[PDB]
């Protein structure tokens, strides 16, 4: 199975997922000097007031907080997007050390972690059909740096001891994802892919410029999770990030002058 070890990590994925060498792979380095302000971008609308979180799952490569996506509640509209994209799950990627962990980089700088809020385009009816489309998904990416604690992350941190190993889940109702956002919605956007197998080229990426701050204690609890299942040799869930991929024939647009 694919993973993040020496023997099954990002450099191996292309053997079972040849799109790994494709024309619009993610993540990428965001060269802030080359990114261009785009006046055609409409205002971005993150509308999470009616979000319904359900469950948190250790899937063996990260943990996902899952949402009710059976109707428009938590949605993402505007910016580069045509129509309405519904929140289905969020998850993070993080490092073994604070100096790495993000997937996107900013002028080559790696953050300690990166949050991905995953949305699917409602015109395609559900997530599975959306990932057959070049505009099926929108992922809102948010960098994490280590400093002050993020109060809106603490409920997540505290449940991780109940989902230590692959295949474990827990109830995670009444969680407000608005508590994970920075103040500013300034962003960069480009067309890309899922960053994990199957690496499908279906994503409009919207990467916020302002990081959130989380405490060292918060990210240390991410690093106590396990890639393995219960009863198997313990392999800490760390360094579950894909490195930056070639930009190829793409431009990164900025929402801000």
Ligand X SMILES: OC[C@H]1O[C@@H](O)[C@H](O)[C@@H](O)[C@@H]1O
Could you list the residues known to form a binding site, using ranges.
Answer: 91, 93, 116, 195-196
Residues annotated as catalytic (active site), given as ranges? 61
If the CB atoms of residues 82 and 171 are measured against ligand GLC, the closer one turns out to be: 171
How many residues make up the chain in this entry?
A: 257
- Specify the pairing of strand 169-171 against strand 53-58: antiparallel
Write out the binding residues for ligand GLC, residues 166-205 only, by CB under 6 A: 171-175
Distance, CA of 89 to CA of 138 (rounded, Å)? 12
By the rule CB under 6 A, 45 interacts with ligand GLC: no
If the CB atoms of residues 197 and 211 are measured against ligand K4N, the closer one turns out to be: 197
Stretch that binds ligand GLC, among 2-10, 34-42, 120-128, 165-173 (CB under 6 A): 165-173
172 binds, among ligand X, ligand GLC, ligand K4N, none (CB under 5 to 8 A by kind): ligand GLC
Q: Which one of residues 14, 73, 123, 155 is an interface residue with ligand GLC (CB under 6 A)? A: 155
Q: Which one of residues 10, 27, 60, 197 is an interface residue with Hg ion (CB under 5 A)? A: 60
Distance, CA of 118 to CA of 141 (rounded, Å)? 9
State the nearest-atom distance from the C-beta of 42 to Zn ion, in Å.
Answer: 25
61 binds, among Hg ion, ligand K4N, ligand GLC, none (CB under 5 to 8 A by kind): Hg ion
By the rule CB under 6 A, 13 interacts with ligand K4N: yes
Q: Which one of residues 116, 150, 166, 209 is an interface residue with Zn ion (CB under 5 A)? A: 116
By the rule CB under 6 A, 15 interacts with ligand K4N: yes
Q: Which residues are annotated as a binding site for Zn(2+)?
A: 91, 93, 116
- Per the structure block, which two tokens stand in for 153? 């992350």
Provide the CA 65 distance to its chain's centre, in angstroms.
Answer: 11
Q: Which residues are annotated as a binding site for substrate?
A: 195-196
State the nearest-atom distance from the C-beta of 109 to ligand K4N, in Å.
Answer: 19
If the CB atoms of residues 196 and 204 are measured against ligand X, the closer one turns out to be: 204
Under 8 Å CB-to-CB from 117, ≥6 apart: which residues? 76, 87, 90, 139, 140, 141, 142, 177, 180
Which residues in this chain contact ligand X in the complex, by CB under 6 A? 36, 251
């Amino acid at each position: 199975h694919w993973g993040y070890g020496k023997h099954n990590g990002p450099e191996h994925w292309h053997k079972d997922f040849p799109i790994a060498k494709g024309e619009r792979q993610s993540p990428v380095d965001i060269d802030t000097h080359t990114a261009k302000y785009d006046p055609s971008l409409k205002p971005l609308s993150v509308s999470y007031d009616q979000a319904t979180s359900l469950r948190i799952l250790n899937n063996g490569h990260a943990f996902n907080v899952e949402f009710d996506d059976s109707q428009d509640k938590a949605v993402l509209k505007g910016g580069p997007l045509d129509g309405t994209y519904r929140l289905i799950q969020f998850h993070f990627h993080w490092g073994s050390l604070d100096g790495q962990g993000s997937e996107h980089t900013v002028d080559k700088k790696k953050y300690a972690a990166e949050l991905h809020l995953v949305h699917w385009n409602t015109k395609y009816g559900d997530f599975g059909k959306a990932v057959q489309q070049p505009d099926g998904l929108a992922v809102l990416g948010i960098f994490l740096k280590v400093g002050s604690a993020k109060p809106g992350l603490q409920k997540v941190v505290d449940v991780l001891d109940s989902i230590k190993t692959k295949g474990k889940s827990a109830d995670f109702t009444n969680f407000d994802p608005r508590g994970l956002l920075p103040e500013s919605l300034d962003y960069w956007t480009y067309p890309g892919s899922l960053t994990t197998p199957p690496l499908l080229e279906c994503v409009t990426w919207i990467v916020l410029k302002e990081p959130i701050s989380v405490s060292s204690e918060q990210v240390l609890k991410f690093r106590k999770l396990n890639f393995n299942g219960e009863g198997e040799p313990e392999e800490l869930m760390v360094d579950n990030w894909r490195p930056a991929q070639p930009l190829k024939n793409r431009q990164i647009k900025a929402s801000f002058k």
